[PDB]
Each structure stands twice: as C-alpha cells, then as structure tokens.
C-alpha cells in the first residue's frame, strides 16, 4: 500500500514545537528542552493499516535553507505552528511559510497542510479571528487543531490528524466548491448497496445492516444506537428511512455526512473492504487471483457456487415466473462495468416460448464460461461479491480441478460432470438441427431466428441412469484441416447426409485423419430421415464401414416432427462419454 | 554514531499511543460523539 | 517460537569490548570511544527465524553489583572477553567471572558461554596455551572466537555465534562425554530417512536427494559437489555409499559430522521442516490442524489421497503378490509411535485365503477411519508425511466435506460415495452372516475365526449401474432402546428369523419406535432360508406387514452355499441409498 | 529521555549485517568450506 509517512513541523522561534514532541515521548512536560529533536519514529502497530510514521523537527538556528528546502521536498504533510499570545506568527504564516512551501512545488500536486495553535493555556476565552481568512484563501489547509502541552490538551490527537492526511485522503472523494461528492464515489457506492441488499426490495432492514457492520467495521453496533442513526437521517432528509429501513439516498447521505464532518476512515474502510483503491477502481488480486491448472485437466464449480447463483436468480426474479426478462437481465448487470452476455447467449442455452433465459439456461451459461476461460468466470464472480457475501479467502475457492484424462482411462472410472462433444460434418447437412435439438426446438422454431445472431456452442442437461450431467456440443466448420483444439474432446458425432451421396466420404475422411488412432469412442448418426433416402456413392456401405471399425450401429434423426424432438441420441453420447472401455456389446 | 540510526519508541506500556490506537479503530457509532478543539472543513 | 535474544558482554577494564559494538554499528574503528554503549538492537530480517537480538554492554565504573547481578539474571548468552597481550585477564576469567555467572545460577540449567580473544593484531604468531584447560574444566564453554576490531577480523561473526547458542542449541542433540548423538535424535532421524526414500530399497539415489535439498534447504546443490560429499563419507566410514548412494548409516554419519564440526543449522532446519520441536517430538498444528465440520455433513478423501495411499501400498509390497504380510505390515508402521491397527481390522475388511490384508481392504480401512473420527485420519496421514511428499499447506487438504442431507432430499440428487447402513435384529439370527457376506466369506470360512477378535463394522465396494461405491454395515446389538447415533443412517436392513416365530415382532417393534416417522427407506430380509421354514406367531403376516408400509418385498438369504455368497441384497441396498424418492415401482 | 528507548540499526545499506545474513542461510554445500580463527567442540 504505502511506504512511510513523514511529518514535518515548521514555525517561528519560541513557539514550543519541540515541546510537543518531547511531551509525546516523555508523557509529561519537560521544563528545559534542547533546541531540536531527533527523528523519533513510531511503529506500525498503532494503526490497523500497518504503516510507520516518522516525525522530524526543524529549527532555524541549527539548520540551513538548502536543508530546509530538501526536507520540505522530502515530506508528505506539513504542520505550521503559531502561538495565540502573539501577532507576528499569524502574519508570518501567510507572509512566508505558505508561500515557501508553494515556492518550489508545482501546481499539479500539493502536500496537505495542518494548522497548529499553541499556548492556549495562557489565554482565557477560546476564539478564532484571523485564521478564518486563511482557510478561505488556500484550499490546502483542512484541519485547525488548537493544543496545549502543559495541560496535555490534544497532544495524541495532532499527529493522528497529520497522519490521516496521508493515509485517508479527502482528495478523490469530496469537492469543497460545489459541496457534493465526486461521481466516481457516487458510482462506487451504488454497487455496494446492491450487493448488501439480499432481497431486492430497495431497502436495508436490521438483518442486512448487522451483516454490513460485521464485515466492514467489526464488533457490530448496539441495538439502541441504530435508531439514533435512523432518527438523525430521518430528521435531516425526507426520503431517508422507509418502513424497512435505509434506502440508497439515506446511505449516500450518511456517507457524505461522514465525509463532511471529518470521520474519513469509516467510509475508506468500507470502500477498501469491497475491493477498491485510492483511485476508486477495482484492483488486481481481487478481480484476477491466481489459480493453477495442470495439463489435461478441467475446471468445475463446486456445490457452494451452485447455491450462490441460485440465490442470485431467486433474488432477481421479481414476478416469480421462473424466467428472466430483459428488464430483470438489465437489473442483473447493473453492478457490472459492461454487459457480459450478448444476443448469442439466448440461442445457446434453453429458453421459454417468448425467448427469455430460464433457470437451467442461467445455470448452463455459467457452466460454459468456467469450462472455456476460467479467468473470465473468476472476474464475473468478483463483481457480484462472492468473497463478501460468502466469507471465504478469494474467488478461487469456487473452482475445483478434476482428475487427469489418462489416469481415468487407466483406472476405468470417471468422476466428472461436464463432457465435450465435437460435431464434424459437411455444410448444409443439418448440423444446427442437431445442436438445436438438445435445447428442445423443432424446425418451426428453428426457422424464426436471425442469421446475424447465430451460435456454434450448445449445452444442456442429460439424465442418464438417474444421474444429471451436462452435455456440450461444438460445431466445427468445414476447413479441410483441423488444429489441436479441434482434436481435444471426449466423443464426436460424425453426421452424414442421406440425400447427398458425397457426404459420407468427408466425415470418414476426417475419421482417417486424426481420430481413429487415438482411443476416443465415436458415433455416426444419420440426418434428415424424413426425406427420401438415396444410395451413397462411396465404395463400402455406410453400415458396413461403421460395423467394420467396432462402432455402435448408426442411428436416425429428423427434426421435422411437430412436437419436441426425442432425446435419445444424446443419452447414448453421454453414456459413451462416461464409459469408453464399455463397448455397446459389453453393456 | 551517525544520523542513519532509527530511534524507536515501543508500543507497549504507553498511554498516548494507546489513545492513538483507540481513536484509530473505525466504528460507525461515532455519529453522536463530539470532540473539542478541532474544526474541520464543512464542520457543523 | 522465541521472544528475544539478549547478548551480554563482560570482561576486564581496557579490553576494547565497547569498541567491538562501535565497530559493528559504525563499520569502521573509532579511535576515541565512550566508556559504555546503549542497547543497540538488531532487527528480525537478518535471520530467517525472524527473532530480534539485543546487545547490551557493561562497564564496572558506570554500573553496580546489584545491576550486574540483575543483567546476568536477565540474559540468555554471555561472552567473556580477554586480551591476548595480558595475563591478568586470563586469570580473572577462571578466578571470578565463570564463578560469578555460576554463583547465583542453579545447577538445573546454565546459560551458554562464548570466549572472546581481542588485541590479536598486536601479537605475531597465533597460539592458544592457557584456554585449553578451561575448555576442559567447564562444559558450558562451546566456542572460542579470536577477533580484532582494527583489521575487522571476525566482527560480524562473533555475535552470530553468540545468537546461534540461543536459537540453534547443541544441548538436546550432542553428548560430549561419550561422543555420539542422543537416542531421541537417533529415533528422530530414522523416520526422516524412510519418508524421503520412495522405493524401499534401503538407499537414497540422486533423484530423492535433490527432492530432499529442495524441501529442506532450498536452492539445491550443484551436480559436482554431491560426489565430493559421497567421497568424504566413503572415506571416513566403510558402510556408507552403496551402489545407488547414501544408506542410513551414511546419512547419520553426515548429520553427526555436521553436529561435531559446528554447522548446527543444517540439521535443525531438517528436523524443523518435518515437524519436530526443540524437545525432539512432533508438534501440535502438524499432527492436529483445524478442520470445520457443519452439522449433518460427512467427510471424504479426494483423488489426491487415493494416489498417495496407492503409492504407499506399491512401495511397501516387496514380493508383488498384491497382499500385505504381517512382516510388511510391521514395516509399514515403523514410522508410527504405536501400532494403529489391531487384529480386529482383518475381520473388518476384505482378505485373501491366508488372512492377509489385500488392496481393496487397505483402501477400505482408510475409507472407514475418515468417516467415523476424522482427527485420527489427519493424525495418521501426518506420520507418513502427506504434507511433505506432496507439496501442500497441511494435512487438511485431503478431506472434502459434502452436501447436507436435507438439501439432497430437497433437490433429489446426491453426489456422495459412502453410505451407512444399520443392521438391527434379534441375537442368534445370523446378523454376522449378513455382515460377513459383503466380504465374500461363506459359513465354512465363518467358522474358523475367534470370538475374542470379533467385529461390529464392515465395509466393501458395491458396483451399481457401472459405478463403484462403498457400503458400510453396522451391527446394533439388542438393547431394548436406541440412542441418537443409532438413528442416524441412510438405510437399514431389518432381519428376521424364519426359524423363530418371535423375531419379526422385535424388528417391527423397532420399526414402530423411531424409524417409520422419518423419511428413511428401509429393507426387510429373511435369514437362514436353507433350514425348514415355520409359520410366524405374529398377528399380521410378514409379507402383508411389509407390503402395507410401501416397502419393497422381502428377499431371501442363506450363507450355507459352498461358493461365495451372492451380492444381490447389497446392490439393492445401495440403490435404495442413492434414490430415496424412487420407489421400486417407479424404477 | 529514558533508558526505555530502543535504538535500532536498519538492515539496508549495511555490509556486516549482509555478511550475517549470508552466513545465516542454511546450505548443505559447506562440507568443504573452512573458516579461520574459530575452534569448536570436537573440531577436526
Ligand atoms: N504554558 C505553556 N508553555 C509552553 C508550552 N509549550 C512550550 N512552552 C514553553 O515555551 C518555551 C519555549 O518553547 P521551546 O520549545 O523552547 O521553543 P522551540 O520550539 O524549541 O523553538 P526554537 O528555538 O526555534 O527551536 C519552553 O521552554 C516551554 O517552557 C505550552 O504548551 N504551554
Ligand atoms: N425435410 C427436412 N428438412 C430439414 C430437416 N432438418 C433441416 N432441414 C433443412 O435442411 C437445411 C439444413 O439445415 P442447417 O442447420 O442450416 O444445415 P447446417 O449443415 O447445420 O449448416 P448451417 O447453415 O451453417 O446451419 C435447413 O435449411 C432446413 O430447411 C428435416 O428434419 N427435414
Ligand atoms: N589494535 C587494537 N586496538 C584496540 C582494539 N580494540 C580496542 N582497541 C583500543 O584499546 C583502547 C581501550 O579500549 P576501550 O574500548 O576504550 O576499553 P573499554 O572496552 O571501554 O573498557 P571499560 O573502560 O571497562 O569500559 C581503545 O581506545 C582502542 O583504541 C583492537 O581490536 N585492536
Ligand atoms: N443351516 C444354516 N445355519 C446357519 C446359516 N447361517 C448361520 N447359521 C448358524 O446360525 C448361527 C447364528 O449365526 P450368528 O452370526 O452367530 O448369529 P448373530 O445373530 O449374528 O449373533 P452373533 O453370535 O453375535 O454373531 C451360527 O452359529 C451358524 O451356525 C445358514 O445359512 N444355514
Ligand atoms: Ca432488504
Ligand atoms: Ca421474470
Ligand atoms: Ca531409493
Ligand atoms: Ca506381500
Ligand atoms: Mg524548537
Ligand atoms: Mg568498555
């Protein structure tokens, strides 16, 4: 985070600026003092941020102007000390010292300043006359602590308010001219409100607020003072406390009153717990943590993520129709910086009659991002707050890594849940009829889609032997050559055309390129069986070429039925995916 | 003996550093609590 | 581990003991010095153990005798400084200072001492005359560093050898009288040898030694100097380097030469990496780490532990008969403090003809300790070195926690692998015939076991629908009342006697106590069907009382067959364990 | 200014403490390497 904090004290001769440091280190006033103190540094266990603090003194008699310019250049915060039983010091604050700090310093960045008033035990009535122009003159003075070392009046408070200038800045949050918050903090606090609200009513009740106090601040509040918080935000603004509790406007009003009364750390702890930085953006190691993937391994989501996603679906489905409208889908991605899902997703996963994403489609899209590119899935779970709403170390505890493929063929047992199938076939032979029969749509529902929004991937659940699994189909286009990623699969579904005699050439040609030599079980299916069959022009018969190579015999498929198509090919493909050593005669 | 020598006050057995540690903790129950002798920007 | 290290320097006036500390902090000799130095402390990033070090000086002119006794009482190591261009100092080392350290100190524990020789630049020939009686007199002097601050001769070496007296002791390892190691370190280094040897030949080759260097010391050795190590241990002892490499005797000889030449840290890093302490015993947080178990959850071993246990079985089966003899079972538990498995285990798990534990019995016993008491399984994997031989954080990464039971009945899907069945029946009705038919033994093999070694638990694998699972049977004895742990199950197997008319009373009585009201699927089986059946004396018929309560119809079982008994009841019990909502009519 | 004040030498930019850190590291390749001017118990 930060390296070190250096506090520099300046001022007039005979103001007792060394006496404050000596009263801090001695815990009692020393009557006779040296003219300068050493660099007394304070350890990192006094602040929960664990950042050390260096205090350095300056005297004009023992130092030089080049040394003063070097220590002013090597600083982070400057405290200017005046004595209230004097008038030359207040004149020299605006005459020299605020010009001499700003003499060499460029106007791009300025160091924050603290004003210190000493010798307040000598005067009787506490007052403030000449300082109030100077706070109206320069925008860099933010705090005007008045102290006395003889009574020990705010001696352990001055250096804390000097350190809070560096560690907890008021720069990127508050604009003092227009007197509201900056819009980056406005956008940075609407997202925290939607994560902590767990039922989407628009209000925070007493149950979610204690969760917020236990996560952010620790040791949560007494049950009486929360109504005092609710009473003061009910008094100062009309649209604050609702029937359930705080709204978004009361939350933002409480945080801007915490900004403009001076307690900066209570909102900086809130924005630093949820993952932001000093520039109000989401950090690395929160969006992108480290996960190791061995070769020939797959990623899966465990049972903890499959309750969080279900609770998100049950949170954002307001009308209880078990479907997501585009209004509720826009409400789902308001915590995201950009919309992750395009119009391609609605043709990939299962849907209802109108064209809305259903329950199993919402699970199957999340069981598709994790299989292909796992870093996008750990990025997408970080926006919703997986590590916050479920108390875990990071986003990487949701993904489990399964066994190797070769050990699973060696020991003849598999524990996996997701299986990839590759569809290789000739163009214009109804491959997309096969990939849209897994989703339950016939040809009359296939005809009313646009070619501009077209998918190559499909995924749906398949029940075999009472057990629920996931089947994924990929359409490999006709290319005349295949790369390595088009070889990696578990089964393939080679499709031929019964109307075209040429087609059983090409797929069998693909079966002679890279697929017979590896031990991959494979299936041959026949498409458009509703049309009249014509005899193929290949040398060996397709049934004979199938039965020669130890294959299961070829099935039949048509998508011209009036109702939903039969799910019988995909059950056999999943069954061959689980048990590659079980030949269909051995079953 | 040069000026490259850090002098460290220990934390334990100190009252002012304990006061620093207790004001350093963030809690939302400071919405009532005043403090004398400091004026900040926009103070009410 | 440790709090702090305090080094105290004593000696005569005008020996330059302050000049060593000033030459350490100034990195150059100061010609004029103050008579005393302050408590200059050295931070924790100079030693990998991360323990700070305090150096304190003493002078007789500025201090007092009570202050000297208090600082000698508040110390850990004392360095006594003599000047070689003097003879009064060597006299005062044995006259006062070694008596004055030992004046108040009890004889139970002594602080270690370092002897320092200064002013060696004045003399010409380095020699050692009068010190060699004193090392032969007191056993506490261990190091005799001679130094000079003018040439900077071993100034950064004296305080390291003083700190190594506290952090890396020679006390519990080496006995200087008999000149061998203590037997706790002898037993503490035989166990490290067997874990690092991964093929049980009795030797360490070049492959395992690089694994040992990479785990223990980091940045492993060059490929040329390992033959120099092997050459010097081949020279100094005859039974050292074998054909493959180092044996146990060469390993112990290398470690005792590292002890008696002074490099104590190389063996302390080895015994501290594998889990031991300063008292040479295994520590907590290594044997007993923390794992949280939610209520109504079960423990399982993942796929990483099911390769480590298989590699242990393939390591310790020398004759390759796929069975463990009691000689190889005694060789397996030589790294254990006590023998974990009694004679009860051979009647619990599967065995061969002679009575030896087989492959699946060795896996099934490890899938029984983890289900019942998980802390004993994380203790037992810590002796074999699961965290060392597979680079992981602890022993708790091998155990995974499954879903709740109630969510699994709610969503009608289970992902578990281990199922518990309870056997409730009348005494002398062949319950142990049922629990020893899962293991494949008939009545003729049942008759040749002793009643003193008798089991109540059984576990074996059951294949259903091509998938391998574990079935566990528990025999609940006749008690007339059942506790809570005898209610917790997945299925039960209520057995009745066809020879005794009373028996179908009692089991059905148990079915009216605590088991009908909960949604637990249950099975009724008939025993000793080889004998002649007699009509039961209950009011309703057993088939009618079975068919009234929505139950599957009662099976038949006899163990009087000549061959192995049929595994058909247990497949049905596992099938009812997986699918409690599937009634046998719904299948 | 009392005697309860720790004076800390920093690690960085020091040669003797770097020598302390380099002799502090454990490595098994010190079976050849001598060192002058120290005699230990049982030294050969
Ligand atoms: N009543 C009262 N007297 C104070 C207070 N602080 C300092 N003094 C007295 O004012 C005198 C002058 O303060 P010094 O600390 O000596 O002045 P200085 O800060 O060292 O200024 P330089 O000479 O420029 O280094 C001290 O001797 C103190 O006795 C205070 O808070 N209250
Ligand atoms: N009679 C009949 N025609 C079908 C049937 N299935 C698909 N067709 C027609 O055959 C054509 C081929 O379907 P496509 O899915 O477009 O073929 P493709 O090989 O996947 O190539 P793409 O155009 O990229 O999708 C479609 O335009 C349909 O009109 C069927 O079951 N019966
Ligand atoms: N040649 C040589 N001279 C040394 C060495 N160490 C110290 N001296 C000189 O010996 C003188 C006496 O040493 P001191 O450090 O002053 O004596 P002391 O340790 O303070 O002893 P006390 O008076 O009891 O506190 C110093 O002034 C050094 O100049 C050394 O290693 N080599
Ligand atoms: N004829 C015949 N006798 C059997 C058969 N099975 C068991 N028996 C006899 O019935 C007796 C009952 O067997 P046990 O296993 O001892 O009965 P239990 O109810 O489990 O009670 P325990 O003594 O604690 O084991 C045995 O002593 C056998 O001799 C069988 O299949 N046929
Ligand atoms: Ca709410
Ligand atoms: Ca809806
Ligand atoms: Ca070996
Ligand atoms: Ca054997
Ligand atoms: Mg001063
Ligand atoms: Mg001295």
mmCIF file of C-alpha atoms in Angstrom, chain A residues 181-361:
data_model
loop_
_atom_site.group_PDB
_atom_site.id
_atom_site.type_symbol
_atom_site.label_atom_id
_atom_site.label_comp_id
_atom_site.label_asym_id
_atom_site.label_seq_id
_atom_site.Cartn_x
_atom_site.Cartn_y
_atom_site.Cartn_z
ATOM 1 C CA UNK A 181 -19.331 14.028 -3.641
ATOM 2 C CA UNK A 182 -17.347 13.231 -6.763
ATOM 3 C CA UNK A 183 -19.252 10.995 -9.246
ATOM 4 C CA UNK A 184 -16.667 8.185 -9.051
ATOM 5 C CA UNK A 185 -17.579 7.741 -5.379
ATOM 6 C CA UNK A 186 -21.276 8.036 -6.314
ATOM 7 C CA UNK A 187 -20.898 5.158 -8.781
ATOM 8 C CA UNK A 188 -18.609 3.408 -6.265
ATOM 9 C CA UNK A 189 -21.295 3.354 -3.543
ATOM 10 C CA UNK A 190 -24.363 2.335 -5.557
ATOM 11 C CA UNK A 191 -22.670 -1.009 -6.290
ATOM 12 C CA UNK A 192 -22.006 -1.662 -2.577
ATOM 13 C CA UNK A 193 -25.714 -1.018 -1.864
ATOM 14 C CA UNK A 194 -26.973 -3.669 -4.301
ATOM 15 C CA UNK A 195 -24.599 -6.402 -3.072
ATOM 16 C CA UNK A 196 -25.518 -5.909 0.604
ATOM 17 C CA UNK A 197 -29.253 -5.871 -0.187
ATOM 18 C CA UNK A 198 -30.174 -9.557 -0.417
ATOM 19 C CA UNK A 199 -33.856 -9.433 -1.420
ATOM 20 C CA UNK A 200 -34.051 -6.530 -3.984
ATOM 21 C CA UNK A 201 -36.828 -4.590 -2.239
ATOM 22 C CA UNK A 202 -34.807 -1.367 -2.393
ATOM 23 C CA UNK A 203 -34.226 -1.016 1.372
ATOM 24 C CA UNK A 204 -31.826 -2.281 4.032
ATOM 25 C CA UNK A 205 -33.501 -3.740 7.118
ATOM 26 C CA UNK A 206 -31.963 -4.605 10.501
ATOM 27 C CA UNK A 207 -30.707 -8.029 9.360
ATOM 28 C CA UNK A 208 -28.528 -6.855 6.453
ATOM 29 C CA UNK A 209 -27.126 -3.869 8.376
ATOM 30 C CA UNK A 210 -25.594 -6.110 11.071
ATOM 31 C CA UNK A 211 -24.003 -8.173 8.276
ATOM 32 C CA UNK A 212 -22.603 -4.903 6.865
ATOM 33 C CA UNK A 213 -21.208 -3.840 10.285
ATOM 34 C CA UNK A 214 -19.694 -7.284 10.898
ATOM 35 C CA UNK A 215 -17.960 -7.370 7.509
ATOM 36 C CA UNK A 216 -16.769 -3.763 7.282
ATOM 37 C CA UNK A 217 -16.086 -2.334 10.739
ATOM 38 C CA UNK A 218 -16.064 -5.431 13.088
ATOM 39 C CA UNK A 219 -17.637 -5.676 16.619
ATOM 40 C CA UNK A 220 -21.130 -4.594 15.457
ATOM 41 C CA UNK A 221 -23.323 -1.920 16.946
ATOM 42 C CA UNK A 222 -25.603 -1.922 19.975
ATOM 43 C CA UNK A 223 -29.329 -2.384 19.164
ATOM 44 C CA UNK A 224 -30.269 1.072 20.560
ATOM 45 C CA UNK A 225 -27.956 3.448 18.643
ATOM 46 C CA UNK A 226 -29.119 2.264 15.199
ATOM 47 C CA UNK A 227 -32.438 4.024 15.783
ATOM 48 C CA UNK A 228 -30.447 7.161 16.689
ATOM 49 C CA UNK A 229 -28.691 6.845 13.301
ATOM 50 C CA UNK A 230 -32.107 6.354 11.675
ATOM 51 C CA UNK A 231 -33.531 9.322 13.628
ATOM 52 C CA UNK A 232 -30.825 11.766 12.530
ATOM 53 C CA UNK A 233 -31.039 10.706 8.865
ATOM 54 C CA UNK A 234 -34.858 10.887 9.170
ATOM 55 C CA UNK A 235 -34.534 14.442 10.529
ATOM 56 C CA UNK A 236 -32.046 15.819 8.027
ATOM 57 C CA UNK A 237 -33.605 14.433 4.805
ATOM 58 C CA UNK A 238 -37.199 13.470 3.963
ATOM 59 C CA UNK A 239 -36.686 10.403 1.721
ATOM 60 C CA UNK A 240 -34.404 8.564 4.145
ATOM 61 C CA UNK A 241 -35.736 5.879 6.495
ATOM 62 C CA UNK A 242 -38.520 3.861 4.852
ATOM 63 C CA UNK A 243 -40.732 1.231 6.527
ATOM 64 C CA UNK A 244 -37.969 -1.395 6.379
ATOM 65 C CA UNK A 245 -35.052 0.985 6.935
ATOM 66 C CA UNK A 246 -32.355 2.827 4.999
ATOM 67 C CA UNK A 247 -32.727 3.478 1.280
ATOM 68 C CA UNK A 248 -29.966 4.373 -1.187
ATOM 69 C CA UNK A 249 -30.400 8.115 -0.559
ATOM 70 C CA UNK A 250 -30.089 7.723 3.217
ATOM 71 C CA UNK A 251 -26.979 5.561 2.729
ATOM 72 C CA UNK A 252 -25.363 8.197 0.497
ATOM 73 C CA UNK A 253 -26.435 10.959 2.910
ATOM 74 C CA UNK A 254 -24.878 9.117 5.874
ATOM 75 C CA UNK A 255 -21.641 8.640 3.932
ATOM 76 C CA UNK A 256 -21.463 12.275 2.789
ATOM 77 C CA UNK A 257 -22.111 13.464 6.359
ATOM 78 C CA UNK A 258 -19.295 11.148 7.492
ATOM 79 C CA UNK A 259 -17.178 12.823 4.794
ATOM 80 C CA UNK A 260 -18.048 16.413 5.687
ATOM 81 C CA UNK A 261 -17.801 16.073 9.464
ATOM 82 C CA UNK A 262 -14.279 14.609 9.269
ATOM 83 C CA UNK A 263 -14.548 10.862 10.011
ATOM 84 C CA UNK A 264 -12.873 9.777 6.781
ATOM 85 C CA UNK A 265 -11.821 6.280 7.909
ATOM 86 C CA UNK A 266 -15.352 4.840 8.236
ATOM 87 C CA UNK A 267 -16.033 5.118 4.505
ATOM 88 C CA UNK A 268 -12.452 4.309 3.446
ATOM 89 C CA UNK A 269 -12.694 1.001 5.332
ATOM 90 C CA UNK A 270 -15.989 0.301 3.511
ATOM 91 C CA UNK A 271 -14.579 1.047 0.044
ATOM 92 C CA UNK A 272 -11.343 -0.822 0.833
ATOM 93 C CA UNK A 273 -13.073 -3.978 2.101
ATOM 94 C CA UNK A 274 -15.173 -4.401 -1.051
ATOM 95 C CA UNK A 275 -12.125 -4.177 -3.312
ATOM 96 C CA UNK A 276 -11.483 -0.611 -4.457
ATOM 97 C CA UNK A 277 -8.333 1.535 -4.300
ATOM 98 C CA UNK A 278 -7.142 5.115 -3.781
ATOM 99 C CA UNK A 279 -8.265 5.881 -7.369
ATOM 100 C CA UNK A 280 -11.791 4.371 -6.846
ATOM 101 C CA UNK A 281 -11.437 1.436 -9.250
ATOM 102 C CA UNK A 282 -11.401 -2.318 -8.731
ATOM 103 C CA UNK A 283 -7.937 -3.733 -8.037
ATOM 104 C CA UNK A 284 -5.928 -6.662 -9.306
ATOM 105 C CA UNK A 285 -5.685 -9.659 -6.875
ATOM 106 C CA UNK A 286 -9.435 -9.125 -6.347
ATOM 107 C CA UNK A 287 -10.665 -9.412 -9.939
ATOM 108 C CA UNK A 288 -7.753 -11.648 -11.029
ATOM 109 C CA UNK A 289 -6.476 -14.063 -8.366
ATOM 110 C CA UNK A 290 -4.116 -16.931 -9.125
ATOM 111 C CA UNK A 291 -5.318 -20.458 -9.925
ATOM 112 C CA UNK A 292 -3.075 -23.237 -11.237
ATOM 113 C CA UNK A 293 -4.319 -25.611 -13.941
ATOM 114 C CA UNK A 294 -2.423 -28.871 -14.624
ATOM 115 C CA UNK A 295 -2.343 -30.045 -18.261
ATOM 116 C CA UNK A 296 -5.227 -32.282 -19.421
ATOM 117 C CA UNK A 297 -7.410 -31.030 -16.559
ATOM 118 C CA UNK A 298 -10.822 -29.364 -16.479
ATOM 119 C CA UNK A 299 -12.446 -26.759 -14.243
ATOM 120 C CA UNK A 300 -15.735 -27.222 -12.408
ATOM 121 C CA UNK A 301 -17.892 -25.257 -9.990
ATOM 122 C CA UNK A 302 -18.446 -26.891 -6.603
ATOM 123 C CA UNK A 303 -21.668 -27.029 -4.568
ATOM 124 C CA UNK A 304 -21.069 -23.641 -2.901
ATOM 125 C CA UNK A 305 -21.291 -21.676 -6.169
ATOM 126 C CA UNK A 306 -24.431 -23.612 -7.197
ATOM 127 C CA UNK A 307 -26.265 -22.105 -4.207
ATOM 128 C CA UNK A 308 -24.981 -18.545 -4.719
ATOM 129 C CA UNK A 309 -26.090 -18.492 -8.374
ATOM 130 C CA UNK A 310 -29.490 -19.943 -7.403
ATOM 131 C CA UNK A 311 -29.880 -17.283 -4.713
ATOM 132 C CA UNK A 312 -28.990 -14.615 -7.309
ATOM 133 C CA UNK A 313 -31.687 -15.987 -9.662
ATOM 134 C CA UNK A 314 -34.235 -16.115 -6.830
ATOM 135 C CA UNK A 315 -33.252 -12.577 -5.799
ATOM 136 C CA UNK A 316 -33.618 -11.017 -9.256
ATOM 137 C CA UNK A 317 -36.810 -12.791 -10.440
ATOM 138 C CA UNK A 318 -39.414 -10.350 -9.114
ATOM 139 C CA UNK A 319 -42.556 -11.614 -10.886
ATOM 140 C CA UNK A 320 -41.818 -15.298 -9.931
ATOM 141 C CA UNK A 321 -42.404 -16.654 -13.451
ATOM 142 C CA UNK A 322 -39.147 -18.743 -13.399
ATOM 143 C CA UNK A 323 -37.818 -16.689 -16.322
ATOM 144 C CA UNK A 324 -35.608 -13.621 -16.763
ATOM 145 C CA UNK A 325 -36.994 -10.722 -18.779
ATOM 146 C CA UNK A 326 -34.559 -8.250 -20.421
ATOM 147 C CA UNK A 327 -35.617 -5.720 -17.751
ATOM 148 C CA UNK A 328 -34.527 -8.125 -14.998
ATOM 149 C CA UNK A 329 -31.456 -9.047 -17.058
ATOM 150 C CA UNK A 330 -30.596 -5.339 -17.221
ATOM 151 C CA UNK A 331 -31.159 -5.194 -13.453
ATOM 152 C CA UNK A 332 -28.762 -8.141 -13.037
ATOM 153 C CA UNK A 333 -25.893 -6.437 -14.895
ATOM 154 C CA UNK A 334 -26.092 -3.019 -13.222
ATOM 155 C CA UNK A 335 -23.215 -3.999 -10.906
ATOM 156 C CA UNK A 336 -21.060 -4.839 -13.995
ATOM 157 C CA UNK A 337 -18.946 -2.270 -15.885
ATOM 158 C CA UNK A 338 -20.116 -3.680 -19.239
ATOM 159 C CA UNK A 339 -22.828 -6.081 -20.383
ATOM 160 C CA UNK A 340 -21.225 -9.565 -20.475
ATOM 161 C CA UNK A 341 -23.850 -11.506 -22.458
ATOM 162 C CA UNK A 342 -24.835 -10.513 -25.975
ATOM 163 C CA UNK A 343 -27.726 -11.817 -28.082
ATOM 164 C CA UNK A 344 -25.761 -15.008 -28.854
ATOM 165 C CA UNK A 345 -26.499 -16.462 -25.375
ATOM 166 C CA UNK A 346 -30.274 -16.758 -25.999
ATOM 167 C CA UNK A 347 -29.611 -19.164 -28.898
ATOM 168 C CA UNK A 348 -27.040 -21.158 -26.878
ATOM 169 C CA UNK A 349 -28.947 -22.050 -23.715
ATOM 170 C CA UNK A 350 -32.516 -23.218 -23.064
ATOM 171 C CA UNK A 351 -35.383 -20.743 -23.250
ATOM 172 C CA UNK A 352 -39.151 -20.431 -22.867
ATOM 173 C CA UNK A 353 -41.787 -19.600 -25.515
ATOM 174 C CA UNK A 354 -41.124 -15.849 -25.739
ATOM 175 C CA UNK A 355 -37.323 -16.050 -25.861
ATOM 176 C CA UNK A 356 -36.272 -15.388 -22.266
ATOM 177 C CA UNK A 357 -33.484 -17.117 -20.338
ATOM 178 C CA UNK A 358 -34.853 -19.754 -17.959
ATOM 179 C CA UNK A 359 -33.489 -21.376 -14.768
ATOM 180 C CA UNK A 360 -31.495 -24.178 -16.387
ATOM 181 C CA UNK A 361 -30.271 -21.822 -19.101
#
